[PDB]
Curated annotation (Swiss-Prot):
PANTHER family: HISTIDINOL PHOSPHATASE-RELATED, HISTIDINOL-PHOSPHATASE. This is Histidinol-phosphatase. It comes from the Bacteria. GO terms for biological process: L-histidine biosynthetic process. It is an enzyme of class 3 (hydrolase). GO terms for cellular component: cytoplasm. Keywords: Amino-acid biosynthesis, Histidine biosynthesis, Hydrolase. Pfam families: PHP. Belongs to the PHP hydrolase family. HisK subfamily. Its EC number is 3.1.3.15. Pathway: Amino-acid biosynthesis; L-histidine biosynthesis; L-histidine from 5-phospho-alpha-D-ribose 1-diphosphate: step 8/9. GO terms for molecular function: histidinol-phosphatase activity. It catalyses: L-histidinol phosphate + H2O = L-histidinol + phosphate.
């Protein structure tokens, strides 16, 4: 059995969420989760929107919840760090400035163009081109940045854009995905299974292919998260992901304390 957890979600501390931290905790307890990790956004110099994070307030609030719910659920304090290698030193100073339990590395913008609905990123660009550019940016991060635990949402690019079918297929991106997966395994990083798009069977297929090939290429650590920006969760999607993880041959999920793997 896998530990019942959620290792990716956002509350009002993140610039694009307004949820109560307490409501995440009570929803988690109601479902019977054993452990959760808040992963609020920090992205440096983000285009169009400030993803800043008030660390004193964030730690204070979660620390109070840790004490209050100590006997009901384990609560960790983490970070979703948007990565851009141009800002590597500043990003590292930020990560090193507070005792985060867990850090997700994510790609949200490339060359100051946000990867999102309605941006220049998808303008006059085929889906195949957008996917390749997105995955090349992910590979660049994995090859040149080390200060994180898990690599976030590899299917992020498939959430957005003007295409009739936004899905991402493993086979169409096989070479770059193998390189990313092997690099993650080689550096003992976790692969995140992100359930945002798990309502779509093509998302399930994509993550199944990621999982099986990650195992083939030496991967060991898997994290699991909803990426929910509200307390309400799609538990069916979480259950679908847990099934895929077990079927791929992983029998444990990775959890972290002070950025070290719990053993
Ligand atoms: N990572 C966020 C995507 O959900 C970036 C964003 C939020 N709102 C506008 N842009
Ligand atoms: N045996 C399952 C995992 O421990 C029980 C469960 C799933 N979701 C909530 N509770
Ligand atoms: Cl669950
Ligand atoms: Cl900033
Ligand atoms: Cl680094
Ligand atoms: Cl949400
Ligand atoms: Cl959800
Ligand atoms: Cl486990
Ligand atoms: Na907010
Ligand atoms: Zn967000
Ligand atoms: Zn993200
Ligand atoms: Zn997120
Ligand atoms: Zn469940």
């Amino acid at each position: 059995s896998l530990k019942k957890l959620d290792y990716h979600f956002h509350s009002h501390f993140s610039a694009d969420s307004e949820e109560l931290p307490r409501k995440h905790v009570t929803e988690a307890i109601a479902h019977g989760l054993e452990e959760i990790c808040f992963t609020e956004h920090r992205d440096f110099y983000f285009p169009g929107m400030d993803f800043s994070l008030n660390l004193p307030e964030y730690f204070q609030e979660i620390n109070q919840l840790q004490a209050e719910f100590k006997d009901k659920i384990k609560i960790k304090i983490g970070l979703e760090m948007g990565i851009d290698l141009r800002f590597k030193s500043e990003i590292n100073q930020f990560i090193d400035s507070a005792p985060f339990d867990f850090v997700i590395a994510s790609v949200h913008e490339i060359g100051d163009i946000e990867v999102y609905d309605g941006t220049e990123f998808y303008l006059q660009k085929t889906k195949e081109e957008a996917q390749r550019e997105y995955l090349l940016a992910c590979l660049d991060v994995v090859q040149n940045f080390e200060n994180y635990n898990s690599f976030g949402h590899l299917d992020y690019v498939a959430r957005y854009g003007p295409y009739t079918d936004k899905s991402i297929k493993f086979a169409e991106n096989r070479e770059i995905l193998f390189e990313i997966l092997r690099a993650l395994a080689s550096k003992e990083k976790a692969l995140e299974i992100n359930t945002r798009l798990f309502d779509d069977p093509k998302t399930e297929q994509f993550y199944s292919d990621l999982l099986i090939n990650f195992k083939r290429l030496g991967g060991k650590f898997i994290t699991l998260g909803t990426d929910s920006h509200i307390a309400k969760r799609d538990w069916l999607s979480i259950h679908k992901a847990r099934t895929l993880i077990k079927k791929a041959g992983f029998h444990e999920l990775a959890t972290f304390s002070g950025m070290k793997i719990d053993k």
